[PDB]
Design a protein around this ligand. Structure first.
Ligand SMILES: *[C@@H]1O[C@H](CO[C@H]2O[C@@H](C)[C@@H](O)[C@@H](O)[C@@H]2O)[C@@H](O[C@@H]2O[C@H](CO)[C@@H](O[C@@H]3O[C@H](CO)[C@@H](O)[C@H](O)[C@@H]3O)[C@H](O)[C@H]2NC(C)=O)[C@H](O)[C@H]1NC(C)=O
Ligand SMILES: *[C@@H]1O[C@H](CO[C@H]2O[C@@H](C)[C@@H](O)[C@@H](O)[C@@H]2O)[C@@H](O[C@@H]2O[C@H](CO)[C@@H](O)[C@H](O)[C@H]2NC(C)=O)[C@H](O)[C@H]1NC(C)=O
Ligand SMILES: *[C@@H]1O[C@H](CO)[C@@H](O[C@@H]2O[C@H](CO)[C@@H](O)[C@H](O)[C@H]2NC(C)=O)[C@H](O)[C@H]1NC(C)=O
Length: 276
């Protein structure tokens, strides 16, 4: 057997074994399958018919360019799907058909340019979507996000987002159950429009290591139950009264600040600024 048997009947590690096809020699009972670093290249319909009990499937760095309709149709119990580092160029509209239990979808560095085209609108069980390290230019969340009533973590870090506009979070405003962690850090973001966050419950908000010189007055005033926020490594303009709102807010909410937002040119912590 080429794969490593971690737990008999349950967990198999098939990493870097030059598989060009899904293995057919493993137990039907398998729950956890790691196929990372294999030249899989294309996933046809019913690729995982031998693995109906799968809960976790790792397809990281498998050179996958295309995923056909029903590629994972068999996988009614899959909770975690990992597609990190595949040069995906064709994702069929029914690519994720059958994934009735999916809670975590990891699509880091999958050549993703927009959420609009991304066929995940039927995955109502989804709790976490990780699309970090991609090519997304817009934070406008598509209408299908209203289907994702269990979403609690959205990672859009290391993308190509330059702005947050008011309309961007429109879909989320109608969703009271929401308790969302939102990572928008490591983006070339230099603009946040006034009123962009209106009373959403963002448990966590990361906007560090962007290109922000300022934020609108009152931008965070309507946030509900914010627990942690990252704002550091931005070129903050600490001239008064421009920095008045943000310095006041960070001072008051200092327990929530992770890391230290600092003034461009002086390095003084933004939370320590007091305008005359
Ligand atoms: C956002 O969701 C809606 C509906 O959500 C349902 O999704 C299913 C999979 C399941 O999770 C369930 O719990 C949700 O209520 C999507 O709109 C619906 O799309 C389906 C097609 O998959 C339509 O069903 C079809 O209906 C026609 C007749 O009307 C039949 O001939 C077909 O066989 C099939 O049953 C359904 O009508 C749509 N509902 C409405 C009111 O639009 C929507 O597509 C989705 N958004 C995205 C972009 O994914
Ligand atoms: C547990 O898995 C076995 C098959 O895997 C066995 O043999 C090795 C691969 C070994 O590493 C270890 O995983 C395990 O002992 C299942 O038995 C097989 O079931 C199929 C039908 O699905 C039969 O056709 C096979 O004859 C039979 N054994 C063989 C030789 O492969 C077994 O059903 C499964 N048990 C549970 C509780 O799910
Ligand atoms: C979002 O916040 C809500 C409100 O506190 C959390 O829901 C509660 O979670 C605790 C612990 O699991 C339970 O004791 C309460 O009964 C829950 N209340 C509800 C709404 O039924 C929720 O867990 C938070 N979400 C995240 C992702 O942390």
């Amino acid at each position: 057997e080429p794969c490593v048997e971690v737990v008999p009947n349950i967990t198999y590690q098939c990493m870097e074994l030059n598989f060009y096809k899904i293995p057919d020699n493993l137990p039907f009972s398998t729950k956890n399958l790691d196929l990372s670093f294999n030249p899989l290249r294309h996933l046809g319909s019913y690729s995982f018919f031998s693995f109906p009990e799968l809960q976790v499937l790792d397809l990281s760095r498998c050179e996958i360019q295309t995923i056909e309709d029903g590629a994972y149709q068999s996988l009614s119990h899959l909770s975690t799907l990992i597609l990190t580092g595949n040069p995906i160029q064709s994702l069929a509209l029914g690519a994720f058909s059958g994934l009735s239990s999916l809670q975590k979808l990891v699509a880091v560095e999958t050549n993703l340019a927009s959420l609009e085209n991304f066929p995940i609108g039927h995955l109502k069980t989804l709790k976490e979507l990780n699309v970090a390290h991609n090519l997304i230019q817009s934070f406008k969340l598509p209408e299908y996000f209203s289907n994702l009533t269990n979403l609690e973590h959205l990672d859009l870090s290391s993308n190509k987002i330059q702005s947050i506009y008011c309309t961007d979070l429109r879909v989320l405003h109608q969703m009271p159950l929401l308790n969302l962690s939102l990572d928008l850090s490591l983006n070339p973001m230099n603009f946040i429009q006034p009123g962009a966050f209106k009373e959403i419950r963002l448990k966590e908000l990361a906007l560090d290591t962007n290109q922000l010189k300022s934020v609108p007055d009152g931008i965070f005033d309507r946030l509900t139950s914010l627990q942690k926020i990252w704002l550091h490594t931005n070129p903050w303009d600490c001239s008064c009264p421009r920095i008045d709102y943000l310095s006041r807010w960070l001072n008051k909410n200092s327990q929530k600040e992770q890391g230290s937002a600092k003034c461009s040119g002086s390095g003084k912590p933004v939370r320590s600024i007091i305008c005359p």
